[PDB]
mmCIF file of all heavy atoms in Angstrom:
data_model
loop_
_atom_site.group_PDB
_atom_site.id
_atom_site.type_symbol
_atom_site.label_atom_id
_atom_site.label_comp_id
_atom_site.label_asym_id
_atom_site.label_seq_id
_atom_site.Cartn_x
_atom_site.Cartn_y
_atom_site.Cartn_z
ATOM 1 N N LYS A 34 35.419 22.468 -5.657
ATOM 2 C CA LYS A 34 36.653 22.332 -4.901
ATOM 3 C C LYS A 34 36.653 23.300 -3.722
ATOM 4 O O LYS A 34 36.019 24.358 -3.767
ATOM 5 C CB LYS A 34 37.859 22.585 -5.810
ATOM 6 C CG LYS A 34 37.612 23.634 -6.902
ATOM 7 C CD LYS A 34 38.875 23.874 -7.730
ATOM 8 C CE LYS A 34 38.665 24.958 -8.778
ATOM 9 N NZ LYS A 34 39.959 25.445 -9.326
ATOM 10 N N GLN A 35 37.374 22.929 -2.654
ATOM 11 C CA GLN A 35 37.329 23.600 -1.356
ATOM 12 C C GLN A 35 37.365 25.122 -1.475
ATOM 13 O O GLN A 35 38.346 25.702 -1.967
ATOM 14 C CB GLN A 35 38.464 23.080 -0.465
ATOM 15 C CG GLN A 35 39.849 23.054 -1.116
ATOM 16 C CD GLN A 35 40.688 24.271 -0.770
ATOM 17 O OE1 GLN A 35 40.565 24.837 0.320
ATOM 18 N NE2 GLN A 35 41.549 24.680 -1.696
ATOM 19 N N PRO A 36 36.281 25.793 -1.092
ATOM 20 C CA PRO A 36 36.239 27.258 -1.182
ATOM 21 C C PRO A 36 37.104 27.885 -0.107
ATOM 22 O O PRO A 36 37.370 27.259 0.931
ATOM 23 C CB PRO A 36 34.758 27.607 -0.943
ATOM 24 C CG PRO A 36 34.008 26.343 -0.948
ATOM 25 C CD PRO A 36 34.943 25.180 -1.013
ATOM 26 N N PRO A 37 37.543 29.112 -0.304
ATOM 27 C CA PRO A 37 38.331 29.812 0.717
ATOM 28 C C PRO A 37 37.433 30.566 1.698
ATOM 29 O O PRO A 37 37.484 31.798 1.817
ATOM 30 C CB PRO A 37 39.201 30.745 -0.133
ATOM 31 C CG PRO A 37 38.326 31.097 -1.286
ATOM 32 C CD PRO A 37 37.416 29.912 -1.535
ATOM 33 N N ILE A 38 36.590 29.811 2.411
ATOM 34 C CA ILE A 38 35.628 30.430 3.320
ATOM 35 C C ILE A 38 36.354 31.168 4.441
ATOM 36 O O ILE A 38 36.116 32.357 4.674
ATOM 37 C CB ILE A 38 34.651 29.375 3.866
ATOM 38 C CG1 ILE A 38 33.631 28.990 2.799
ATOM 39 C CG2 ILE A 38 33.903 29.900 5.071
ATOM 40 C CD1 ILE A 38 32.806 27.772 3.167
ATOM 41 N N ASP A 39 37.265 30.483 5.143
ATOM 42 C CA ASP A 39 37.942 31.116 6.273
ATOM 43 C C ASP A 39 38.758 32.329 5.824
ATOM 44 O O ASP A 39 38.850 33.331 6.548
ATOM 45 C CB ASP A 39 38.835 30.100 6.995
ATOM 46 C CG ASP A 39 38.059 29.243 8.009
ATOM 47 O OD1 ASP A 39 37.385 29.804 8.911
ATOM 48 O OD2 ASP A 39 38.125 27.996 7.889
ATOM 49 N N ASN A 40 39.336 32.265 4.627
ATOM 50 C CA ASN A 40 40.030 33.411 4.053
ATOM 51 C C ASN A 40 39.118 34.636 3.966
ATOM 52 O O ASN A 40 39.512 35.753 4.324
ATOM 53 C CB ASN A 40 40.542 33.012 2.673
ATOM 54 C CG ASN A 40 41.354 31.736 2.717
ATOM 55 O OD1 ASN A 40 40.812 30.641 2.559
ATOM 56 N ND2 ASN A 40 42.667 31.865 2.875
ATOM 57 N N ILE A 41 37.885 34.442 3.483
ATOM 58 C CA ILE A 41 36.933 35.550 3.334
ATOM 59 C C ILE A 41 36.472 36.039 4.695
ATOM 60 O O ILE A 41 36.242 37.238 4.899
ATOM 61 C CB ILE A 41 35.750 35.109 2.460
ATOM 62 C CG1 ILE A 41 36.211 34.690 1.070
ATOM 63 C CG2 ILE A 41 34.699 36.202 2.354
ATOM 64 C CD1 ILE A 41 36.638 35.846 0.220
ATOM 65 N N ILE A 42 36.286 35.113 5.636
ATOM 66 C CA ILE A 42 35.898 35.499 6.991
ATOM 67 C C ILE A 42 36.984 36.369 7.606
ATOM 68 O O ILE A 42 36.707 37.432 8.171
ATOM 69 C CB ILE A 42 35.639 34.240 7.844
ATOM 70 C CG1 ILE A 42 34.283 33.622 7.517
ATOM 71 C CG2 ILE A 42 35.679 34.578 9.323
ATOM 72 C CD1 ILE A 42 34.211 32.142 7.806
ATOM 73 N N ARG A 43 38.245 35.939 7.466
ATOM 74 C CA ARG A 43 39.366 36.612 8.112
ATOM 75 C C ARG A 43 39.580 37.999 7.543
ATOM 76 O O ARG A 43 40.128 38.881 8.216
ATOM 77 C CB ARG A 43 40.631 35.760 7.951
ATOM 78 C CG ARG A 43 40.827 34.675 9.033
ATOM 79 C CD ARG A 43 42.227 34.003 9.013
ATOM 80 N NE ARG A 43 42.358 32.955 7.998
ATOM 81 C CZ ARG A 43 42.165 31.657 8.243
ATOM 82 N NH1 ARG A 43 41.851 31.260 9.474
ATOM 83 N NH2 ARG A 43 42.292 30.755 7.273
ATOM 84 N N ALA A 44 39.157 38.224 6.294
ATOM 85 C CA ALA A 44 39.360 39.498 5.636
ATOM 86 C C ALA A 44 38.420 40.584 6.131
ATOM 87 O O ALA A 44 38.621 41.759 5.784
ATOM 88 C CB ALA A 44 39.196 39.331 4.128
ATOM 89 N N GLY A 45 37.402 40.239 6.912
ATOM 90 C CA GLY A 45 36.440 41.206 7.389
ATOM 91 C C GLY A 45 35.305 41.467 6.439
ATOM 92 O O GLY A 45 34.592 42.462 6.608
ATOM 93 N N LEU A 46 35.096 40.593 5.455
ATOM 94 C CA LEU A 46 34.109 40.840 4.411
ATOM 95 C C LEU A 46 32.674 40.551 4.838
ATOM 96 O O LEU A 46 31.746 40.957 4.129
ATOM 97 C CB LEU A 46 34.447 39.998 3.188
ATOM 98 C CG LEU A 46 35.725 40.460 2.505
ATOM 99 C CD1 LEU A 46 36.029 39.615 1.276
ATOM 100 C CD2 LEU A 46 35.577 41.929 2.138
ATOM 101 N N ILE A 47 32.457 39.861 5.952
ATOM 102 C CA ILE A 47 31.103 39.452 6.304
ATOM 103 C C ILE A 47 30.249 40.649 6.718
ATOM 104 O O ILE A 47 29.099 40.746 6.268
ATOM 105 C CB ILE A 47 31.103 38.372 7.399
ATOM 106 C CG1 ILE A 47 31.496 37.017 6.812
ATOM 107 C CG2 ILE A 47 29.735 38.273 8.032
ATOM 108 C CD1 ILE A 47 31.550 35.925 7.856
ATOM 109 N N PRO A 48 30.728 41.579 7.556
ATOM 110 C CA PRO A 48 29.895 42.761 7.829
ATOM 111 C C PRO A 48 29.576 43.557 6.580
ATOM 112 O O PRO A 48 28.468 44.093 6.454
ATOM 113 C CB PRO A 48 30.744 43.564 8.822
ATOM 114 C CG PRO A 48 31.601 42.555 9.471
ATOM 115 C CD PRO A 48 31.944 41.584 8.393
ATOM 116 N N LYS A 49 30.513 43.642 5.635
ATOM 117 C CA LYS A 49 30.229 44.355 4.395
ATOM 118 C C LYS A 49 29.156 43.638 3.587
ATOM 119 O O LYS A 49 28.269 44.281 3.013
ATOM 120 C CB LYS A 49 31.508 44.516 3.573
ATOM 121 C CG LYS A 49 32.621 45.295 4.268
ATOM 122 C CD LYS A 49 32.199 46.730 4.557
ATOM 123 C CE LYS A 49 32.078 47.556 3.279
ATOM 124 N NZ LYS A 49 31.722 48.979 3.563
ATOM 125 N N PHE A 50 29.219 42.306 3.534
ATOM 126 C CA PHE A 50 28.176 41.547 2.853
ATOM 127 C C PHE A 50 26.823 41.759 3.514
ATOM 128 O O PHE A 50 25.810 41.968 2.831
ATOM 129 C CB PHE A 50 28.540 40.064 2.832
ATOM 130 C CG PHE A 50 29.703 39.732 1.925
ATOM 131 C CD1 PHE A 50 30.419 38.557 2.090
ATOM 132 C CD2 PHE A 50 30.068 40.589 0.899
ATOM 133 C CE1 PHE A 50 31.480 38.249 1.254
ATOM 134 C CE2 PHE A 50 31.130 40.288 0.062
ATOM 135 C CZ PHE A 50 31.836 39.119 0.238
ATOM 136 N N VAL A 51 26.789 41.729 4.845
ATOM 137 C CA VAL A 51 25.531 41.926 5.556
ATOM 138 C C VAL A 51 24.973 43.315 5.276
ATOM 139 O O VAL A 51 23.761 43.492 5.116
ATOM 140 C CB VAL A 51 25.733 41.677 7.062
ATOM 141 C CG1 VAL A 51 24.586 42.270 7.864
ATOM 142 C CG2 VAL A 51 25.886 40.182 7.336
ATOM 143 N N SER A 52 25.845 44.323 5.194
ATOM 144 C CA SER A 52 25.359 45.666 4.913
ATOM 145 C C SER A 52 24.864 45.784 3.480
ATOM 146 O O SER A 52 23.938 46.555 3.202
ATOM 147 C CB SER A 52 26.456 46.692 5.195
ATOM 148 O OG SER A 52 27.644 46.351 4.508
#
Side-chain angles (χ1 to χ4, degrees):
Chain A
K34 34 178 183 165
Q35 49 97 31
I38 285 169
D39 277 305
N40 307 91
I41 300 288
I42 283 154
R43 274 191 279 265
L46 292 181
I47 284 178
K49 300 297 290 182
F50 290 160
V51 163
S52 53

